[PDB]
């Protein structure tokens, strides 16, 4: 049950002399049971959630996760 986020987050307080292109464009896959503790982490950072996608199976299926 994995999602597929794509997240644009800026650097809040620090001016990072290394590149950190990947630290502004997490387009990772997060599973369902730990997305919502993870979604608030981007949300408290001031990031922007662009899209979320169901990379796994069908919604509404109440068994088999």
């Amino acid at each position: 049950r994995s999602f597929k986020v794509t997240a644009c987050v800026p650097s809040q307080t620090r001016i990072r002399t290394q590149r950190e292109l990947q630290n502004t464009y997490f387009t990772k896959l997060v599973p369902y049971d730990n997305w919502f503790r993870e979604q608030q982490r981007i949300m408290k950072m001031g990031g922007k959630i662009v899209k979320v996608e169901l990379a796994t199976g069908k919604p509404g299926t109440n068994t088999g996760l």
């Binding site: 109440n62 068994t63 088999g64 996760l65």
Partner: protein
């Protein structure tokens, strides 16, 4: 199911499923023509199991029938049989599945939340479920209730 729990465990070890567990699926499929009698007997007594286990519960906890509990009135004792029937509509989904993977995702995973959110104490809910799975063990055979009664009594410790 027991097929489903074995293959997700073998994915975690990143190997094929073990010959210890391959006995169990082989034991599940020779008992696949053993599990189906438990499923059909609960069809023939689902109007008999629930209508007796309510009064078994209401003689154990008559705080519910008193005015002020969460099932008081004829419109309110409808759900205190309907939520019990819904749990009888969960075991037969997992008798033939063998284990608790349809028991969890329909019944268990947030059941501390919504009965608190509806105001019903789950200790009364688990009591009638325990009152249910004394009558269903007496209805089934001594060999049927030896394993399904162990499977019956998961839900009482899972709820409360």
């Amino acid at each position: 199911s027991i097929v489903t729990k074995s293959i997700v465990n073998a994915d975690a070890e990143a190997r094929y499923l073990s010959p210890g567990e391959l006995d169990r699926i082989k034991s599940f499929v020779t008992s696949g023509e053993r599990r189906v009698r438990i499923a059909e007997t609960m069809t023939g007594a689902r109007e008999r199991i629930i209508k007796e286990a309510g009064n078994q519960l209401f003689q154990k906890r008559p705080d519910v029938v008193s005015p002020g509990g969460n099932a008081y009135g004829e419109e309110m004792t409808a759900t205190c049989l309907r939520d019990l029937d819904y749990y009888l509509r969960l075991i037969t989904y997992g008798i033939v599945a063998g284990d608790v993977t349809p028991i969890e995702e329909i019944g268990v995973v947030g059941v501390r939340e919504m009965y608190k959110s509806l105001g019903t104490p789950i200790e009364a809910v688990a009591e009638g479920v325990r009152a249910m799975k004394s009558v269903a063990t007496s209805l089934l055979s001594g060999e049927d209730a030896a394993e399904a009664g162990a499977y019956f009594d998961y839900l009482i410790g899972a709820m409360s």
